[PDB]
């Protein structure tokens, strides 16, 4: 099992995008996914002010700059991987479809409809 | 004679003859939404009271005589004071703390009755 | 004790003592519209079931004993299996294909009863 960095695509696809402190970061994760089988690791990041949200075209926003210095601390709680595929498998970071980030939280829930009427045989007569 | 709430200051037994008077009075896009919310709410409130009467065995009635005994701890007064001296507004205040207890008892006695009636058929 | 749907895994006769538990749980402009639609629908669904009980002669009841015989072709089982072994979810699946037939029969026997009761008065 091998890990590899992302394949070519747009910045929003190949990097780790996140919004923190009010600014939009695009970090290079090639330092995390570079191994066979299995201090700190420093990931460089780029910053953008003009943001096209989701996968829409035609509606851009400008993110005002944030004064001062930004510091963020967060928890990585999971990964989105795509399998590249006869004795080995390669996994690469994936993403770009936001539904995958909510599917991971809503997986435990189901919605059902209540149907309160029913009939059954009993031993009585009106 | 009297219209809506006209009997509000009357005694409990003078009132309670006017039950149909009050029962019948319960029935720009943002502006339109506010009005629908008002109408939907009136319907929902109406239905909750009707459902509640239903589970107590009082569906379709304005006066419903039940089979739950009155506990003297809820109100230690005789019929003369309650029906001939007090008004419904005063009464509601007097027994406010027991309303949920009474409602629970009414639901339970109906469940027991409803099952006994099945066994007899 | 148990709350809403707590008896869902219980047998049919263990359940059916909790009928009031489930019965009571049935009760930016675009966002507001979506919520009104949800509320209007809950009311309409409630009323359709109540109308249906009404035409079958079961208005105001949670348990209603009717005068329609059970056809062995709908479910060939004895009371012991149905009420002591099965759950309501299992039962609903077992007789799904006969629900509309049963409902039609209930409507008709009530129409006949309702007319006989007029002739006797």
């Amino acid at each position, epitope marked *: 099992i091998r890990f590899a960095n992302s394949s070519g695509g747009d910045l929003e696809v190949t990097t780790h995008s996140f919004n923190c402190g009010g600014e939009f970061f695009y970090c290079n994760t090639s330092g995390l996914f570079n191994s066979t089988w299995i201090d700190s690791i420093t990931l460089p990041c780029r910053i953008k002010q003009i943001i096209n949200m989701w996968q829409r075209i035609g509606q851009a926003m400008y993110a005002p700059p944030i004064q001062g210095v930004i510091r963020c601390v967060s928890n990585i709680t999971g990964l989105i991987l795509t399998r590249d595929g006869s004795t080995t498998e390669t996994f690469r970071p994936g993403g770009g479809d936001m539904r995958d980030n909510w599917r991971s939280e809503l997986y435990k829930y189901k919605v059902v409809k209540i149907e309160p009427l029913g009939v059954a045989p009993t*031993r009585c007569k009106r | 004679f009297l219209g809506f709430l006209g009997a509000a200051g009357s005694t409990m037994g003078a009132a309670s003859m006017t039950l149909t008077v009050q029962a019948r009075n319960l029935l720009l896009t943002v502006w339109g939404i506010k009005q629908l919310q008002a109408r939907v709410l009136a319907v929902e409130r109406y239905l909750r009271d009707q459902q509640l009467l239903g589970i107590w065995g009082c569906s379709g009635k304005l006066i419903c005589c039940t089979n739950v005994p009155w506990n003297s701890s809820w109100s230690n007064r005789n019929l003369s004071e309650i029906w001939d001296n007090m008004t419904w507004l005063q009464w509601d205040k007097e027994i406010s703390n027991y309303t949920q207890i009474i409602y629970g008892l009414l639901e339970e006695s109906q469940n027991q009755q409803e*099952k006994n009636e*099945q*066994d007899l058929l | 004790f148990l709350g809403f749907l707590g008896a869902a895994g219980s047998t049919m006769g263990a359940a059916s003592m909790t009928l009031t538990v489930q019965a009571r749980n049935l009760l930016l402009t675009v966002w507001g519209i979506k919520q009104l639609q949800a509320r209007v629908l809950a009311v309409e669904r409630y009323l359709r079931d109540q109308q249906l009980l009404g035409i079958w002669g079961c208005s105001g009841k949670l348990i209603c004993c009717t005068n329609v015989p059970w056809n062995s072709s709908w479910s060939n089982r004895n*009371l*012991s299996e149905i*009420w002591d072994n099965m759950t309501w979810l299992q039962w609903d699946k077992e007789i799904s294909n006969y629900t509309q037939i049963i409902y039609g029969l209930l409507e008709e026997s009530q129409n006949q009863q309702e007319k006989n009761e007029q002739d006797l008065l």
Partner: antibody, heavy 124, light 109 residues
Framework: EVQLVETGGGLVQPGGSLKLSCRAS????????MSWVRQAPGKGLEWVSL????????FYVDSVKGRFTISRDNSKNTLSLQMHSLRDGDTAVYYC??????????????????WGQGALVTVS | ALTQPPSVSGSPGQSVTISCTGT?????????VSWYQQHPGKAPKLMIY???QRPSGVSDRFSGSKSGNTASLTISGLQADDEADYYC???????????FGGGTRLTVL
């Protein structure tokens, strides 16, 4: 094997009262309807009273209807029969029995499955 | 109520029949006619219930049926151990729940 054990006094004056009871074991008490049946000292059996499994419905034979009360307590597995007034004609063996009715959501009985040994009651 | 006053008898191995006669708005219309066995000094035992059925634990020497307003109990391979009084009863409807007939003494010869 199940047991029904009648207890209670066997000798009273007419015009008095008498309480009989019956302890049950070996079956779910709360699942069955129960009844009392008399046996006259020299004759046959007579039905006296019937109570529902839940204790809510009671039925009596006309001859004791205004005098006897049948009662049940499912937490102690017991029946009781409270006699009042008492007549010489009530002298009999009183049997505790399981059966008699049904629960309407279960197959019917309308017969008695189990009998106790019988309490003997004499009215002087 | 129900009736059958005579004693009944026969030798071991011979069958015997015990009848039980009632009325139409009683035994005729309701198919709930049990039979009970009682040895003197003992509590009754259920032998037949409903009309033809027997409880588990009851031998197949005991069977029964009804016709019109009369029910009957049949004992086949009669044993000396069958010397007991036999009673019939019936569900007589609501209001009058149960009635019993007089018992008949079975004598084995």
């Amino acid at each position: 094997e199940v047991q029904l054990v009648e207890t209670g006094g066997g000798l009273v004056q007419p015009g008095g009262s008498l309480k009989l009871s019956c302890r049950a074991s070996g079956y779910t008490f709360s699942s069955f309807a129960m009844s009392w049946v008399r046996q006259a000292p020299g004759k046959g059996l007579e039905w006296v009273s019937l109570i529902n499994d839940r204790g809510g419905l009671t039925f009596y034979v006309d001859s004791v209807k205004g005098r006897f009360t049948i009662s049940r307590d499912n937490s102690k597995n017991t029946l009781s029969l409270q006699m009042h007034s008492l007549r010489d004609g009530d002298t009999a063996v009183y049997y505790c029995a399981t059966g008699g009715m049904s629960s309407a959501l279960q197959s019917s009985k309308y017969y008695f499955d189990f009998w106790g040994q019988g309490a003997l009651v004499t009215v002087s | 109520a129900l009736t059958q006053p005579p004693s009944v008898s026969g030798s071991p191995g011979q069958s015997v029949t015990i009848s039980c006669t009632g009325t139409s708005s009683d035994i005729g219309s309701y198919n709930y006619v049990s039979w009970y066995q009682q040895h003197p000094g003992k509590a009754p035992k259920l032998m037949i219930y409903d009309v033809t059925q027997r409880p588990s634990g009851v031998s197949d020497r005991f069977s029964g049926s009804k016709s019109g307003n009369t029910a009957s109990l049949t004992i086949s391979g009669l044993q000396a151990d069958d010397e007991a009084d036999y009673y019939c009863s019936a569900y007589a409807g609501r209001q009058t729940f149960y009635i019993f007939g007089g018992g008949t003494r079975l004598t084995v010869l």
